[PDB]
PDB file of all heavy atoms in Angstrom:
ATOM      1  N   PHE A  12     -33.354  11.966  -7.698  1.00 57.71           N
ATOM      2  CA  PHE A  12     -33.906  12.160  -9.016  1.00 57.71           C
ATOM      3  C   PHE A  12     -33.047  13.127  -9.789  1.00 57.71           C
ATOM      4  O   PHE A  12     -32.118  13.690  -9.260  1.00 57.71           O
ATOM      5  CB  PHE A  12     -35.327  12.678  -8.938  1.00 57.71           C
ATOM      6  CG  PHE A  12     -36.276  11.741  -8.279  1.00 57.71           C
ATOM      7  CD1 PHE A  12     -36.469  11.778  -6.934  1.00 57.71           C
ATOM      8  CD2 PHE A  12     -36.973  10.836  -9.004  1.00 57.71           C
ATOM      9  CE1 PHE A  12     -37.348  10.927  -6.322  1.00 57.71           C
ATOM     10  CE2 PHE A  12     -37.846   9.980  -8.395  1.00 57.71           C
ATOM     11  CZ  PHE A  12     -38.036  10.022  -7.054  1.00 57.71           C
ATOM     12  N   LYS A  13     -33.361  13.307 -11.054  1.00 58.93           N
ATOM     13  CA  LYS A  13     -32.541  14.131 -11.907  1.00 58.93           C
ATOM     14  C   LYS A  13     -32.554  15.531 -11.398  1.00 58.93           C
ATOM     15  O   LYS A  13     -31.605  16.267 -11.587  1.00 58.93           O
ATOM     16  CB  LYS A  13     -33.051  14.116 -13.329  1.00 58.93           C
ATOM     17  CG  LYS A  13     -32.133  14.827 -14.297  1.00 58.93           C
ATOM     18  CD  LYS A  13     -32.244  14.250 -15.693  1.00 58.93           C
ATOM     19  CE  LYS A  13     -33.688  14.067 -16.112  1.00 58.93           C
ATOM     20  NZ  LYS A  13     -33.867  12.850 -16.944  1.00 58.93           N
ATOM     21  N   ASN A  14     -33.634  15.897 -10.733  1.00 58.67           N
ATOM     22  CA  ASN A  14     -33.829  17.268 -10.319  1.00 58.67           C
ATOM     23  C   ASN A  14     -33.278  17.540  -8.953  1.00 58.67           C
ATOM     24  O   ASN A  14     -33.460  18.606  -8.421  1.00 58.67           O
ATOM     25  CB  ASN A  14     -35.286  17.652 -10.391  1.00 58.67           C
ATOM     26  CG  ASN A  14     -36.124  16.872  -9.446  1.00 58.67           C
ATOM     27  OD1 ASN A  14     -35.627  16.278  -8.508  1.00 58.67           O
ATOM     28  ND2 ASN A  14     -37.413  16.883  -9.671  1.00 58.67           N
ATOM     29  N   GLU A  15     -32.681  16.495  -8.372  1.00 56.52           N
ATOM     30  CA  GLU A  15     -31.957  16.682  -7.151  1.00 56.52           C
ATOM     31  C   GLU A  15     -32.860  16.522  -5.963  1.00 56.52           C
ATOM     32  O   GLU A  15     -32.456  16.752  -4.857  1.00 56.52           O
ATOM     33  CB  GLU A  15     -31.306  18.059  -7.150  1.00 56.52           C
ATOM     34  CG  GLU A  15     -30.195  18.274  -8.170  1.00 56.52           C
ATOM     35  CD  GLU A  15     -29.657  19.691  -8.147  1.00 56.52           C
ATOM     36  OE1 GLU A  15     -30.318  20.511  -7.454  1.00 56.52           O
ATOM     37  OE2 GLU A  15     -28.626  19.977  -8.786  1.00 56.52           O
ATOM     38  N   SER A  16     -34.073  16.066  -6.210  1.00 56.11           N
ATOM     39  CA  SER A  16     -35.028  15.747  -5.170  1.00 56.11           C
ATOM     40  C   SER A  16     -34.541  14.460  -4.599  1.00 56.11           C
ATOM     41  O   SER A  16     -33.525  13.997  -5.017  1.00 56.11           O
ATOM     42  CB  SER A  16     -36.422  15.602  -5.740  1.00 56.11           C
ATOM     43  OG  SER A  16     -36.476  14.513  -6.630  1.00 56.11           O
ATOM     44  N   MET A  17     -35.216  13.900  -3.619  1.00 54.25           N
ATOM     45  CA  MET A  17     -34.674  12.750  -2.932  1.00 54.25           C
ATOM     46  C   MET A  17     -35.726  11.795  -2.465  1.00 54.25           C
ATOM     47  O   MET A  17     -36.827  12.190  -2.194  1.00 54.25           O
ATOM     48  CB  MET A  17     -33.929  13.234  -1.716  1.00 54.25           C
ATOM     49  CG  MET A  17     -33.246  12.155  -0.932  1.00 54.25           C
ATOM     50  SD  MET A  17     -32.321  12.876   0.396  1.00 54.25           S
ATOM     51  CE  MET A  17     -30.915  13.450  -0.504  1.00 54.25           C
ATOM     52  N   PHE A  18     -35.376  10.534  -2.341  1.00 54.20           N
ATOM     53  CA  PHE A  18     -36.296   9.573  -1.805  1.00 54.20           C
ATOM     54  C   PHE A  18     -35.559   8.563  -0.980  1.00 54.20           C
ATOM     55  O   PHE A  18     -34.368   8.473  -1.058  1.00 54.20           O
ATOM     56  CB  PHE A  18     -37.151   8.943  -2.887  1.00 54.20           C
ATOM     57  CG  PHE A  18     -36.493   7.839  -3.632  1.00 54.20           C
ATOM     58  CD1 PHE A  18     -36.355   6.613  -3.067  1.00 54.20           C
ATOM     59  CD2 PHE A  18     -36.064   8.022  -4.907  1.00 54.20           C
ATOM     60  CE1 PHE A  18     -35.768   5.588  -3.742  1.00 54.20           C
ATOM     61  CE2 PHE A  18     -35.469   7.010  -5.584  1.00 54.20           C
ATOM     62  CZ  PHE A  18     -35.322   5.789  -5.000  1.00 54.20           C
ATOM     63  N   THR A  19     -36.270   7.853  -0.137  1.00 53.42           N
ATOM     64  CA  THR A  19     -35.626   7.013   0.821  1.00 53.42           C
ATOM     65  C   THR A  19     -36.555   5.890   1.125  1.00 53.42           C
ATOM     66  O   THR A  19     -37.735   6.048   1.052  1.00 53.42           O
ATOM     67  CB  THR A  19     -35.340   7.862   2.046  1.00 53.42           C
ATOM     68  OG1 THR A  19     -34.196   8.648   1.768  1.00 53.42           O
ATOM     69  CG2 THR A  19     -35.086   7.059   3.266  1.00 53.42           C
ATOM     70  N   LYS A  20     -36.017   4.718   1.420  1.00 50.33           N
ATOM     71  CA  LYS A  20     -36.818   3.557   1.761  1.00 50.33           C
ATOM     72  C   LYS A  20     -36.059   2.689   2.729  1.00 50.33           C
ATOM     73  O   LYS A  20     -34.874   2.572   2.639  1.00 50.33           O
ATOM     74  CB  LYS A  20     -37.085   2.733   0.511  1.00 50.33           C
ATOM     75  CG  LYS A  20     -38.534   2.398   0.230  1.00 50.33           C
ATOM     76  CD  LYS A  20     -39.066   1.325   1.152  1.00 50.33           C
ATOM     77  CE  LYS A  20     -40.542   1.071   0.954  1.00 50.33           C
ATOM     78  NZ  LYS A  20     -41.061   0.082   1.930  1.00 50.33           N
ATOM     79  N   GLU A  21     -36.764   2.040   3.625  1.00 44.76           N
ATOM     80  CA  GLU A  21     -36.177   1.071   4.497  1.00 44.76           C
ATOM     81  C   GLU A  21     -36.912  -0.214   4.288  1.00 44.76           C
ATOM     82  O   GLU A  21     -38.109  -0.246   4.390  1.00 44.76           O
ATOM     83  CB  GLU A  21     -36.412   1.510   5.918  1.00 44.76           C
ATOM     84  CG  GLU A  21     -35.295   1.199   6.876  1.00 44.76           C
ATOM     85  CD  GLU A  21     -35.764   1.099   8.299  1.00 44.76           C
ATOM     86  OE1 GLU A  21     -36.943   1.323   8.561  1.00 44.76           O
ATOM     87  OE2 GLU A  21     -34.949   0.797   9.169  1.00 44.76           O
ATOM     88  N   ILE A  22     -36.207  -1.284   3.984  1.00 47.67           N
ATOM     89  CA  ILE A  22     -36.852  -2.562   3.806  1.00 47.67           C
ATOM     90  C   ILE A  22     -36.050  -3.613   4.484  1.00 47.67           C
ATOM     91  O   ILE A  22     -34.857  -3.478   4.620  1.00 47.67           O
ATOM     92  CB  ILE A  22     -36.904  -2.965   2.347  1.00 47.67           C
ATOM     93  CG1 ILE A  22     -37.182  -1.772   1.482  1.00 47.67           C
ATOM     94  CG2 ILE A  22     -37.989  -3.983   2.117  1.00 47.67           C
ATOM     95  CD1 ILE A  22     -37.288  -2.119   0.023  1.00 47.67           C
ATOM     96  N   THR A  23     -36.712  -4.673   4.893  1.00 47.83           N
ATOM     97  CA  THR A  23     -36.014  -5.815   5.396  1.00 47.83           C
ATOM     98  C   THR A  23     -36.202  -6.900   4.379  1.00 47.83           C
ATOM     99  O   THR A  23     -37.307  -7.242   4.054  1.00 47.83           O
ATOM    100  CB  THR A  23     -36.613  -6.260   6.705  1.00 47.83           C
ATOM    101  OG1 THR A  23     -36.394  -5.242   7.671  1.00 47.83           O
ATOM    102  CG2 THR A  23     -35.952  -7.481   7.164  1.00 47.83           C
TER     103      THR A  23
END
Side-chain angles (χ1 to χ4, degrees):
Chain A
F12 297 89
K13 187 152 46 216
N14 64 18
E15 293 177 350
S16 64
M17 183 176 282
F18 81 76
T19 282
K20 233 286 175 184
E21 215 205 357
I22 321 182
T23 295

